[PDB]
């Protein structure tokens, strides 16, 4: 009966990334050390178990700044945030361990698994 | 050298709809005369030129309740909101004209284009 649009989800995601880039309706700043990352809570909750728990916690849900562990690699976090909004995970010899560890912290187990397959590749 | 996750956009979209279903971080009620639909502004702005204009307008950006034209068919809107959050457009002979007219009003020409292909095959 029904019609399914195969590019719809990727087009929504493209436009969400364009909203992030223009800073339109971004409602949280994630802080890693002194580095600040602007985002939409809902996109974060849709990609990460950590962010889900944080923004359904009544003590934290209304905060505009969330501070993650300052021991987290900011390049690792930046790679993963770009990934949430793009589907593209840019992995390098030099950044891969940091990304894997950051993905564990964010409870994005499937990204970890993809990093493990990547390591098995070479 | 990038890895691209081909199911990522649709998995994000599934989770956004689960968030809509559980009423989590919904920040707007769209009103069609007296019918009500809870949504996330950013999904609406990612899908429709009309909603983009509404939520970037300084008079309306901080409203928790938004009126659409109260004469639009509420079934037509409801089919389209579900489409925004699912990729699935459920077209029957009984609703096609209401969906098409509503899509024009939401500035979703590619959906209108599809309803025209549906008219051409039916």
């Amino acid at each position: 009966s029904c019609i399914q649009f195969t590019r719809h989800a990727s087009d929504v995601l493209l436009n969400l990334n364009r909203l992030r880039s223009r800073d339109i309706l971004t409602d949280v700043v994630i802080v890693v050390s002194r580095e600040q990352f602007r985002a939409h809570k809902t996109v974060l909750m849709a990609c990460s178990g950590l962010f889900y728990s944080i923004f359904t916690d009544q003590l934290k849900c209304n905060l505009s700044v969330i501070n993650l562990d300052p021991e987290i690699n900011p390049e690792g976090f930046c790679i993963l945030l770009d990934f949430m909004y793009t589907s593209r995970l840019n992995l390098r010899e030099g950044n891969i361990m940091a990304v894997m560890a950051t993905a564990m912290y964010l409870q994005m187990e499937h990204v970890v698994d993809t990093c493990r397959k990547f390591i098995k590749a070479s | 050298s990038c890895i691209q996750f081909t199911r990522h956009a649709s998995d994000v979209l599934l989770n956004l709809n689960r968030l809509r279903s559980r009423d989590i971080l919904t920040d707007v009620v769209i009103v069609v005369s007296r019918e009500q639909f809870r949504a996330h502004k950013t999904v609406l702005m990612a899908c429709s030129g009309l909603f983009y204009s509404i939520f970037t307008d300084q008079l309306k950006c901080n409203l928790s309740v938004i009126n659409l034209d109260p004469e639009i068919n509420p079934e037509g809107f409801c089919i389209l909101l579900d489409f925004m959050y699912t990729s699935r457009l459920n077209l029957r002979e009984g609703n096609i004209m209401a969906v098409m007219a509503t899509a024009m009003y939401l500035q979703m020409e590619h959906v209108v284009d599809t309803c025209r292909k549906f008219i051409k095959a039916s």
Binding site: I3, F5, R7, R22, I24 | Y52, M108, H110, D113
Partner: peptide, 13 residues
């Protein structure tokens, strides 16, 4: 279930 690959016409500025 029929599929279409049509691209979304709306692009955020």
């Amino acid at each position: 279930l029929w599929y279409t690959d049509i691209r979304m016409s709306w692009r955020v500025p």
